[PDB]
Amino acid sequence: EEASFLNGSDVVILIDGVEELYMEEIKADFEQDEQSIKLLGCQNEISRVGTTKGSFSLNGYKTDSKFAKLGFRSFEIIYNLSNSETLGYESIRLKNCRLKKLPLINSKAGEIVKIEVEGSFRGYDLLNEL
Amino acid sequence: EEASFLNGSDVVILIDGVEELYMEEIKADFEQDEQSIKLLGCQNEISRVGTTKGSFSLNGYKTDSKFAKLGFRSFEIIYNLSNSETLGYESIRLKNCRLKKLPLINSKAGEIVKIEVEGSFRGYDLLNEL
Amino acid sequence: EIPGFYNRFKTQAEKSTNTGLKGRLAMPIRANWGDVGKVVTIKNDLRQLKNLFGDDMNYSAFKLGKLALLGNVKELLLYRLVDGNQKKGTLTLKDTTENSAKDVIKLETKYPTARNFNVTIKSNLVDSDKKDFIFFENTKQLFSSSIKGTIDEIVLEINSNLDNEYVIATKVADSDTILANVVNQALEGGNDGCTSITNESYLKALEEFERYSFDSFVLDGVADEALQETTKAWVAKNKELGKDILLFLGGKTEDNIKQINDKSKSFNDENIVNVGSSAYYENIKYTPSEVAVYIAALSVSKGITGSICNAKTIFEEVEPRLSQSEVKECLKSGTLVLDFDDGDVIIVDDVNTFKKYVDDKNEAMGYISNIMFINTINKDTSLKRKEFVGKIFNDATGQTTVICALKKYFEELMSQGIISEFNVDIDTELQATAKADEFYWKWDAVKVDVMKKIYGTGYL
Amino acid sequence: LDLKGSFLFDFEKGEFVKNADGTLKKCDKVQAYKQWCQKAILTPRYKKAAYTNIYGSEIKDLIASNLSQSAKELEITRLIKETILVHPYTKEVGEFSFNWLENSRLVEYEFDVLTIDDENIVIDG
Amino acid sequence: LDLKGSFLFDFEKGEFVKNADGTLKKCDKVQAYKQWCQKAILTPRYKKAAYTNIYGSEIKDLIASNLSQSAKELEITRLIKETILVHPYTKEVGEFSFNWLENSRLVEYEFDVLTIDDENIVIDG
Amino acid sequence: VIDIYLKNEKEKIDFHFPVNPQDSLSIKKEKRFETVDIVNLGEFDIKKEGEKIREISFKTFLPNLYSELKNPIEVVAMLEKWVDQAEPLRLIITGFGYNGLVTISSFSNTQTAGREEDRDIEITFRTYRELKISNTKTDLKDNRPNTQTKSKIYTVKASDTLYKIAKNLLGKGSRWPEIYNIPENKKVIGKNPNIIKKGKLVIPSK
């Protein structure tokens, strides 16, 4: 047993090839509409794969009008997670992603102006596997 | 790394060109009904853009019958967020917005008379990008 | 080839039908042609057998090899048994310009044989500076080619062309002028060694076969008692070495039902099978020893799932036709008998020689399919054994790994529908004294059998 | 039906096989049909003016086509199948197989079925 | 059909081309048709009383129209297409293109297809 | 991998669909038969010898910007033109493994509220067939579809002869007087049909 975990401090995100270092949360999932159909002779139901759909959520602290200016244009998100205790790093890129809604305005009381972005992505590429 | 965030204290809101400084919360989103359809040969689903719909929520402390008197008339909301640590400011205006419901009455116990407004807006304009 | 469209046509018999076959068989064949004194594998192709050992039906190679091939065996391990006295067809060709007629080229058959390879060289009518070298097998042309007069090219050209799988040229000496014209000069001096095969010579094939692995072994269509007893001991020896070989035999041609049944009763090993009937195939008789080749091939080809309880054989007629009582005696004696039914020769009941005891659980051991099922599992476990003997740490995790491997392997047999229920577990008794390669385990399974008989009762 | 025999022609040598008598080697109806099938495959369509539009194939023209691999496989199946089936003796051609043994160099199989290959029902009143 | 030839007329010079003999330069049916097409395009409809309602176009009147750019593009396509197609020799006109090279000053292309441009099927029983 | 190709021939256009057929393809097959009842026996099925026309349908969208591409408006105009084409179209579907002559029965485009540049398409095809209206004897069947097209005007080559042009370009070859009797062909060709020159433009009939 050894400590080889990873921390969000190591996260590096290039929104369209630009380091959006101000994003303090990110998550992306690649789900499949697995059809499940029940066969006559088989007791247990059979699950059949289907087409995949990529969704991603990304929220941070506002520092400019980047996303509002970006609009619904297609773009790319490159995510790099690097182990610092030992060398090696994971690197992912969402092949073609679009926003589902512009967080046009958001603010409340004395709190910092947080920004939340949600969208979908067609596909992905796994550039490094650790 | 440097501190260049923004705080809701810097928020300036002109409801129909009038400083409604008593609103201590605002948020507006500009969402799109992104159609998602699955193609025969492509494993991953294809997402197709659609028409946009603008929604906004705005709540504060009551100080007059402005909103009840306003009714469902169309109007404009100009939002200005200004960086104070460094110069520069964002400026948005919701091009054509209407209330979805008049908060006609609301009060409870010894609490301050808060007011909550929800509506939709047809479009927007980005007047400054920081 | 040039870019473009090319096409050919082939008879449907030339289809690559070798896919999907099963089983491995061995044979100490007598052959007129091919490699001598070694085992060779054939992938169930008639042409491959034809090229490797010719097509002389007089010789046991092509004859029995064809029958085993018709049995749909995945791989046939043929050994060219020989008497000795082995020789290759050879010839020496001579030069013209030297009045002494200098010998310059020696030709030789690719393999030892006695067939009539012949050479005819004539002046090339287009150009005397060349000559046409036509290679013959008896009166049949076998290969033709024109050649330059220089000796080195002539040996090269003979060894160059595709159709010289039969003969290889060799230079004895150099010369300038072309070889002398000759017609149909036989490559004398060869010998196939089929003459007067010794009883002992079979034993050489046995030892050679031992290094290989095969599902069953069948004799070369010979009912000699000494060979059968020798092979009986040989197969029994290989069982003690872990090699589970199934033996197929057939009694002598003149043996009656009494002799055959006594022979089967005399040795009732479950690894031994006696054929008690000759058979016909396009007017060519096959003695019970010869028929055992086809019986062995069918049993081996069926593998685990199938059986030959009522398989329709390729044969056309069986000389000894037995009544039900005679069938019952032969079947009770462990004799495997083919029966004629409505123009069809059908093997009956899948029996082996083991019928004397059938002590309760050993009743199943009297059938070939049951024994084949048992032997294959032992082979599969033996394969998995040798991957771990003294090569994995004998710990509980490692032992659990072995059990997981064996348990999953049996689960594949469940997927085939072969087995209804199975269990594999730690042999706690023999586990009390474990060592590096002496971990011990136990198992038992319930083989699914093929439907054999039906009883109907018409209530009225 | 009464199809008739024809004369052998070794496509390997590109010459007619003739007996020692010197007469050309006759052969069976079925042999003639197989001889015809290979010839029709090798004859490009619409180009050799002796024959009508029915005869011949178009496999050579497919080489220059820009269709994908899978599309070319179907076109090969259509072209070979159409060319052969014009003969009365053909019953069915199919079971096509393909093997792109190199990056862009192909080997394909197909199986032909004769009229005589049909299975006949056995019954009479 | 038997369309007939006509006489050249250099639209650049606005005069008939005549040979050194002094006779007007005759030209081919297809040349005559091309000569006719340009003339019909330049002839406004309903205004030059010599011709019936079939002849002529209305492109000039579209200039004063208040329709949007895209609407004017379709009207140009309709007007040019309608004017040309009256001729028997026309098969099809289309593939229109537009380029508003300045703010409100336009250049457009279109492609004409003759009756002879048709492709004919090759077959007979 | 899946692709769709429509190889029009009367217009030598090899259209390739930019977009795969949305959700799912499907082709039916139904044996052509009739049902008949018999007194005291009941229903029976009688097969009818003829085959049956069957349809292939799907839907797509012609995107504005994507691999070869063209404007959706022109593509719709292309297909709508092809709908009225009497001559058949060759449809090939790679992954589905379909290949045969078809003709477009119905076609429809659509502009959604957003995505105004794209055009949602719903198309339907019908399996195509042909109607082929002394010394009786067995001969080759006329199964080959005759889908091949040539220009309506021919440029004579060096080795050509008027009979050869007729056979290559009009079938039987004895059809040459049809080419010659056209007055334009008579004018360009000499008064001797047997004599011809490389270049002369010739107009096959129809």
Author numbering:
A (entry chain Z), B (entry chain Y): 8 to 137
C (entry chain g): 13 to 472
D (entry chain l), E (entry chain k): 24 to 148
F (entry chain T): 2 to 67, 75 to 141, 150 to 215, 217 to 223
Kindly provide excerpts from the paper associated with this entry.
Here, we reveal the extended and contracted atomic structures of an intact contractile-tailed phage (φCD508) that binds to and penetrates the protective S-layer of the Gram-positive human pathogen Clostridioides difficile.
The tail is terminated by the baseplate. Importantly, the baseplate of φCD508 must be adapted for binding and penetration of the host cell S-layer. These are organized into a baseplate hub, which connects to the tail, and a wedge, which forms a collar around the needle. The baseplate is also expected to include the host attachment proteins gp67 and gp68, constituting the tail fiber and receptor binding proteins that bind to the C. difficile S-layer. Although these could not be sufficiently resolved in the EM maps for atomic modeling, low-pass–filtered maps show protrusions for the tail fibers. It is striking that we find no obvious auxiliary domains with structural homology to peptidoglycan hydrolases in any of the φCD508 baseplate or needle proteins built to near completion within our cryoEM maps.
